[PDB]
Design an enzyme around this catalytic site. Structure first.
Site, mmCIF file in Angstrom:
data_model
loop_
_atom_site.group_PDB
_atom_site.id
_atom_site.type_symbol
_atom_site.label_atom_id
_atom_site.label_comp_id
_atom_site.label_asym_id
_atom_site.label_seq_id
_atom_site.Cartn_x
_atom_site.Cartn_y
_atom_site.Cartn_z
ATOM 1 N N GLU A 50 1.472 -0.423 -5.036
ATOM 2 C CA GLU A 50 0.677 0.328 -5.367
ATOM 3 C C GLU A 50 1.334 1.761 -5.740
ATOM 4 O OE1 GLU A 50 -1.528 2.451 -2.433
ATOM 5 O OE2 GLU A 50 -2.948 3.259 -4.203
ATOM 6 N N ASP A 70 0.777 -1.279 -0.038
ATOM 7 C CA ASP A 70 0.046 -0.093 0.067
ATOM 8 C C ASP A 70 0.864 1.478 -0.013
ATOM 9 O OD1 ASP A 70 -2.532 1.239 0.454
ATOM 10 O OD2 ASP A 70 -1.699 2.131 2.190
ATOM 11 N N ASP A 104 -10.558 2.180 -4.252
ATOM 12 C CA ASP A 104 -10.146 3.721 -4.326
ATOM 13 C C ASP A 104 -10.862 4.305 -5.541
ATOM 14 O OD1 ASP A 104 -8.579 3.818 -1.827
ATOM 15 O OD2 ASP A 104 -6.771 2.906 -2.997
#
Ligand SMILES: [Ca+2]
Ligand SMILES: [Ca+2]
Ligand SMILES: [Ca+2]
Ligand SMILES: [Ca+2]
Lengths: 181, 403
Positions: free
Chosen positions: B204, B179, B289
């Site tokens: 990410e 993340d 997201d």
């Protein structure tokens, strides 16, 4: 004070009595900030970003959170209020504040009167911070009501334009000294 | 290999625990041909979705369920033959206690001993007000809402790798999804990847695409995909590290609305990361997201099947989103697409040959076995060679298979 000062593109510190353009650190991300209607609302105007890299947008006035003036220098990690030094058709306050309502499921920073004031009344509190641990002078803006949230701009044209708001990717900014107004 | 994100932004609210609910989805997940399930951040977190972890070892405090339920879920997946990957949130961390200054900067790992029990010295140097100014400066971007961890501190690296190994050995996770990977250097990510030896890892890294005055992405996005390729190369191009192909997602978002010519680069190659290093790119239509209930960068709702027709037949490793598979009534069409990919041996490095890329037509052949068509163009039969039968078709998409 303690937090280092925020610097403009010419390396000078940000003054609370000067106007600055808030541009993208990388011009590939677009031009400066401005105001625009959208999502069906005529007013209040949202804080928008001009997609054109050559456009500086509207000059902004950064001010130590109300009761904090001292040396007129604007420093990192400190509460600040922000206003566009420009005239609008909405004839409302041109100061920024995080929206209490979602528009298309997104939270944006808008202009004008604070519709539903929180007890804290901190909807208009923002902060400037370094984007990374690097020495370079590249910053990011945060909305700090209850908690601080990094801000980015919605670039998918939902609502009619690019709008500033609580979203990724965070917008990495640089400040250019603008003419007095 | 095909990934599946097994949660959305609302999963934590599920009546009876998300792990529990997912147990009833494993037969369907395994049967579709999914090889890896990406699970939500497991530890205690101030924010319910888990992206603001505190006590890293405390899995029982998660809104998704407890340690027992997690282990059973992974056990069921493993038995089915599918791997489980954990969402690793280590750029930032939330503190358990206030120090002398009244700042929440005293951490707690979740064990009775001192594992992960750091203080403001482990917080990045300039991350005010949390930091005490003694740590090292941040190796990457800062995350505004919480204290950034100083990954250059040796105890930090040591105890984090130890937690990663625990997640693997005790809990049973097979790999990681990093993340907010832009929050720390590739050098830092390399240490964790090398020392935890995951079978799969995906980072990410999300930065803005390059835009024009019209407010839409530029035709060329090399600067953007170069950044993803640069990271993979630094951590190890021969290892298990990959990156989410945000370049393709950003381009497909707008290409699909009458601008399919955007899908062919000047060199006749795909415009996103899959056009340069497909082996290291994992494609997707939306995630928790971009879509779900956050709407940061949603794919046009009425054209999601075009997005799936593209990623499921194309090079790179596709990732199917929970909602689209189960909630949107797209399961059968998506199932068929994975089946087409699976039966023909299409993989992350399959050869892509773009035949046509007009505003209303994108036609491509992959590995000489499958031909995919996106767009409203009614009749394109004249362009599809002999020995190809329709394998699947739907709203503005069709796919042919050889033999
Ligand atoms: Ca402890
Ligand atoms: Ca931080
Ligand atoms: Ca995030
Ligand atoms: Ca960081």
């Amino acid at each position: 004070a303690d937090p280092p000062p925020v610097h403009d593109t010419d390396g000078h510190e940000l003054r609370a009595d000067a106007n600055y353009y808030v541009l993208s650190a990388n011009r590939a991300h677009g031009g400066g900030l401005t105001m625009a209607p959208g999502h069906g609302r005529h007013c209040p105007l949202f804080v928008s970003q001009d997609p054109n890299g050559q456009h500086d947008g509207f000059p902004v006035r950064i001010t130590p959170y109300g009761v904090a003036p001292s040396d007129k220098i604007i420093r990192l990690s400190t509460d600040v209020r922000i206003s566009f030094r420009a005239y609008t058709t909405c004839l409302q306050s041109t100061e920024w504040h995080i929206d209490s309502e979602l528009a298309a499921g997104r939270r944006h920073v808008i202009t004008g009167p604070v519709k539903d004031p929180s007890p804290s009344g901190r909807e208009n509190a923002f902060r400037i911070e370094k984007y990374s641990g690097a020495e370079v002078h590249e910053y990011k803006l945060m909305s700090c009501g209850d908690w601080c949230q990094d801000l980015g701009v919605f670039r998918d044209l939902k609502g009619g334009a690019w709008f500033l708001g609580a979203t990724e990717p965070y917008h990495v900014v640089v400040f250019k000294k603008a003419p007095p107004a | 290999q095909v990934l599946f994100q097994g949660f959305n932004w609302e999963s934590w609210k599920h009546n009876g625990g998300w792990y529990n609910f997912l147990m009833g989805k494993v037969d369907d997940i395994a049967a579709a041909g999914i090889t890896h399930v990406w699970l939500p951040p497991a530890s205690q977190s101030v924010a319910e979705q888990g992206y603001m972890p505190g006590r890293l070892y405390d899995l029982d405090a998660s809104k998704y369920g407890n340690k027992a339920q997690l282990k059973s879920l992974i056990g069921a997946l493993h038995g089915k033959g599918v791997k489980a990957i954990a969402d690793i949130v280590i750029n930032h961390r939330t503190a358990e206690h206030k120090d002398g200054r009244g700042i929440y900067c005293i951490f707690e790992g979740g064990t009775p001993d001192a594992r992960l029990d750091w203080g403001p010295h482990m917080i990045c140097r300039d991350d005010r007000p949390y930091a005490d100014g003694t740590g090292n400066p941040d190796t990457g971007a800062d995350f505004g809402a919480a204290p950034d961890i100083d990954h250059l501190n040796l105890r930090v690296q040591k105890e984090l790798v130890e937690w990663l190994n625990w997640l693997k050995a005790d809990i049973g996770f097979d790999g990681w999804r990093f993340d907010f990977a832009k929050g720390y250097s590739a050098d830092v990510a390399k240490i964790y990847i090398d020392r935890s030896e995951p079978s799969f890892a995906v980072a990410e890294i999300w930065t803005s695409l390059a835009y024009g005055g019209d407010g839409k992405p530029n035709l060329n996005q090399d600067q953007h995909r170069q950044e993803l390729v640069n990271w993979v190369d630094k951590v190890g191009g021969k290892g298990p590290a990959t990156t989410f192909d945000f370049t393709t997602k950003g381009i497909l978002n707008v290409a699909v609305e009458g601008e399919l010519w955007r899908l062919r680069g000047t060199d006749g190659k795909a415009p996103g990361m899959i056009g340069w290093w497909p082996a290291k790119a994992v494609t997707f239509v939306d995630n928790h997201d971009t879509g779900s209930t956050q709407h940061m960068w949603p794919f046009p709702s009425d054209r999601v099947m075009q997005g799936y027709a593209y990623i499921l037949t194309h090079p790179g490793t596709p990732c199917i989103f929970y909602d689209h598979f189960f909630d949107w009534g797209l399961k059968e069409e998506i199932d068929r697409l994975v089946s087409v990919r699976t039966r023909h041996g299409i993989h992350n490095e399959s050869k892509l040959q773009i035949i046509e890329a007009d505003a209303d037509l994108y036609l491509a052949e992959i590995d000489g076995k499958v031909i995919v068509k996106l767009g409203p163009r009614y009749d394109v039969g004249n362009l599809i060679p002999g020995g190809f039968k329709v394998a699947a078709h739907g709203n503005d998409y069709a796919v042919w298979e050889k033999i």
